[PDB]
């Protein structure tokens, strides 16, 4: 906004903003017992099995 | 009584060393479908279940030790 005092005039301005993303990583470990993995493939035998 | 023998049809043919990867060239690129245990990154879902990963657990490494059979005097090896 210009005005009538002795101040210098104002040229038009321009601004440029540089923004970037950030990487993040997430991870958890599950253990599974070897017999639990195996007897999912073992055959049905008896009503206790 | 052959049901007992049908058990040994299951267990012996189920427990073998994995055979050699040999596919004739006239079949084509079917051999790439016969490579499953080298695949080591299985896909996951929102709610994964065993039925989604029962194929994932099926590939397991090949581990079989070699035993030793010793016939010992009962005096040297303490019985318990």
Residues with Cβ within 8 Å of B35's Cβ and at least 6 positions away in sequence, in order, are B21
CA pair distance B79, B72, nearest whole angstrom? 11
CB pairs under 8 A between A and B: 8
Residues 6-65 of B with CB under 8 A from A: 10, 50, 54, 57-58, 60
Structure tokens at B73: 């005097």
C-alpha angle A47-B12-B24 in degrees, rounded to nearest 5: 125
Residues with Cβ within 8 Å of B62's Cβ and at least 6 positions away in sequence, in order, are B17, B18
**φ and ψ at B70, to 5 degrees?**
-120, 135
Spatial CA neighbour of B61 closest among B40, B42, B34, B44? B40
């Amino acid at each position: 906004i210009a005005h009538g005092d002795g101040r210098r005039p104002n040229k038009q301005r321009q601004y440029i903003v540089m923004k970037a993303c950030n990487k993040h990583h997430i991870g958890a470990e599950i253990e599974l017992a070897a017999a639990d993995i195996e007897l999912l493939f073992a055959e049905k035998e008896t009503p206790l099995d | 009584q052959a049901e007992n023998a049908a058990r040994l049809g299951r267990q012996v043919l189920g427990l073998l060393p994995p055979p050699t990867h040999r596919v004739s060239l006239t079949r084509g690129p079917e051999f790439a479908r016969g490579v499953r245990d080298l695949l080591s990154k299985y896909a996951a879902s929102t709610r994964p279940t065993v039925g989604s990963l029962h194929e994932a657990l099926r590939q397991a490494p090949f581990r079989q030790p070699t035993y030793g059979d010793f016939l010992v005097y009962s005096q040297t090896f303490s019985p318990q």
